[PDB]
Amino acid sequence: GAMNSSNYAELFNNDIKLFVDDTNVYRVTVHKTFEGNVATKAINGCIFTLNPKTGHLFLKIIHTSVWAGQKRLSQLAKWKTAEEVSALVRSLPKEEQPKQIIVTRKAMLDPLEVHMLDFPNIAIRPTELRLPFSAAMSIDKLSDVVMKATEPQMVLFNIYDDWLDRISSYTAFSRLTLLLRALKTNEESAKMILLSDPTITIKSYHLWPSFTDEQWITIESQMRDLILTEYGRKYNV
Amino acid sequence: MNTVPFTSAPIEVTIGIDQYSFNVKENQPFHGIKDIPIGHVHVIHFQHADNSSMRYGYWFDCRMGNFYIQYDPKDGLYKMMEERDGAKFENIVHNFKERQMMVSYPKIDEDDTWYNLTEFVQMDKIRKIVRKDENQFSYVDSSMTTVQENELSDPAHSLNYTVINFKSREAIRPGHEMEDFLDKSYYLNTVMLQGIFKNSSNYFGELQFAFLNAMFFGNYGSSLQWHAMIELICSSATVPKHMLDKLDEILYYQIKTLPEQYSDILLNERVWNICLYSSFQKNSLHNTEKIMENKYPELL
Ligand SMILES: CCOC(=O)c1ccc(F)c([N+](=O)[O-])c1
Known part of the structure; x- marks a missing residue:
């Protein structure tokens, strides 16, 4: 079930798990048009997928071309996130695949559950913690690689450095x-x-x-x- | 017009026949129901005066045999049985009819309610949902669980409704995850209608049978099935026009017949609000939307 203050040490046991945060997947600037209407311009985003035990961060960069010609982008963004997380899991060797994925926003549950039907033994869980992963784009090196990307790209980091x-x-x-x-x-x-x-x-x-x-x-x-x-x-x- | 005679009535019981009902007292001289319309399935159902627990009953079609009711004091219920001796049966019934010990199926001539509730319901399909092949009639009660309920425990006593699960590989084509989850047309039209049910009549028949089991026995898994089959249509962007028009009629008569006091437990707020106000078919169920708004505006 849901992850909260009461089962907090579960994050650091030896069952592989990932947090997935989708806050920064679909990012826009809002501006005025010459006619004085309002429009958005997308900018590059990223999926923040983190192993809290090891610090390994799978930063999937979401290039603005993925939104071209698509409608209802905030809804699509959740499904794109789930598609990319599912593709990451399939890319990992069986013994590195997570046993649980914890989504930071409940609106990711059904998209991820549907994309992970092939993995019935991977638990998809919400959390009651208000985690600050939206601030990942305040980390200069992460923001830099996202903004410079000219195509879809996955970049791997350890968010704990050598701690x-x-x-x-x-x-x-x-x-x-x-x-x-x-x-x-x-x-x-x-x-x-x-x-x-x-x-x-x-x-x-x-x-x-x-x-x-x-x-x-x-x-x-x-x-x-x-x-x-x-x-x-x-x-x- | 056919007859289901009763051997006797040794325990006080409320007896239902389709949407009608009457009280029989302990050892009252009651010997059955006559003038039952030919051409429809029917259900004869029971609630004992001492134990309102377990409503139970029997789905049957008088064209398929001569059925009668007898009370079993060991198993403690009214049992349907089939009489193979047609001469014994004609003799038993005429005797009961002459002594005027039968209630008459009380259909008003203007009234198409039962036809409208059972239009697509066939006895042969009932007997595949309720498996007991040695009998031509089918027992259902309040407690029987469905195959899908059992997956999430006695299989011989289960309701084998078609399993519908919106977050299942059957419902979701690899590579069309978002598309198939938000628009269920491929699941409705290809998987269920073309693949499993073969035509919309069999789909509506199962939907109507699930509703009737929910209404007459308070069978919870039947209610789940009814709502799932509604939601699968309303959540499909591409539905044949004739199916939508017929669904509106089916649901209208179901909502019309539902006891006003049972709406709290037999109507799922989420499904109905989604179907009438958010779904693709939010504008395609005019008759159903109008009766729901005038009869159950609280739920919405
Ligand atoms: C084996 C003995 O048979 C019965 O007792 C019997 C059979 C058919 C029937 F219609 C009725 N009845 O009371 O309605 C009774």
């Missing part, structure tokens, strides 16, 4: 969701925090800066401050 050498999956996921929640609540501030000290760099093969253990504690504290703040700035408290 698992020093910390557990549970802790790594908690750091990731704290970072993304901050980026979602106040992107400018969050990004200032992450880069303020130019002596800490991002390795070419990494997404995040090379903080020491002690610097991650300070970073993490600054992100909590931002989130609580913004929460005040918002509701006035």
Whole structure:
């Protein structure tokens, strides 16, 4: 069934599972036309498919050509997502295929269930967690590869960098969701925090800066401050 | 006009014959039902006064044999049986008719209700849904489960309705996932009509039989089947015009006949609102939409 605060450690057991987030699949800019009407222009998007135990991210880039000549694009986007997740599963060796797929939005359940009929033993699950994966396009290297794509493309990343050498999956996921929640609540501030000290760099093969253990504690504290703040700035408290 | 005589009535029971019903008291001198119209299937059904649990009954067609009812004190129910001795049966019935111990099937001449509810229902198809080949009539009751209910437990006592499942490989062509799920025309027309039912008459017959079992016995799996067969048509963008026109008539008479007080349990809010207001056929069921809005506007 649904994934929530009560069965949270299930994410870090040894049953392969993937989160699928479709927020950034269909992206548009809204603009005025010469006649003064409104129109949309699609921009490249991506499916965010993440193994929360290992950090492996299957970033399927959705090029704007997939929408050409199609109607009802927000509905199509959910089915395109399910098509691409199903194709990813079929592409993996049997022993790497997930036992569960957790969708971050309930509207993905029927599209994914229908595309996965061939896999009756893979459980498709919703979640009650409000996960911040929409903020993935605030990660500069992810945004860059999506915007530069000229054709459909899958790009593989480890969203934890090398953190698992020093910390557990549970802790790594908690750091990731704290970072993304901050980026979602106040992107400018969050990004200032992450880069303020130019002596800490991002390795070419990494997404995040090379903080020491002690610097991650300070970073993490600054992100909590931002989130609580913004929460005040918002509701006035 | 045919007759289903009753050996006796040893326990107090409400007896139904099609859409009619009457109360019989314990050991009342009741000996059956006469003037039953030839040309239709019929159902004779029972609810004991002491145990309203288990409505049960028998689907039959008097053209197929001479059937009678007898009370079995061991199994505790009124059983339908077939009399092979046609002379014994003519003799038994005439005797009952002369002593005026039979109720008359009370059809008003103007009234086409039963025809309209059973237009496509055939006894030979009933006997494939309800498997008991040694009898020419078919027993149904409130508790019997359907084949599909059993997949999700005694198979001899099941309702073998055609399995309909919108999230199944049978319903969804590889490579047409979105198309077939949002427009079920290929499942309706190719899989079900051309493949399984062979024609729309057999499809409507099963739909009508499922409704009648839901209504007369409160059979939950029959209600599920009825709604699934409605939803499969309404969720298809491409349906023959004659099928839509006939479906409107079928459903109109079903909604008209439904007891006003049973709408809460026999009508699925989601299906009816989808079918009348969202589906491809939202504008194709004028008679059904009008009676639903005037009789059950709460559900909608
Ligand atoms: C084997 C003994 O047969 C009966 O008792 C019998 C048979 C046919 C029939 F119509 C009726 N009846 O009461 O209606 C009774």
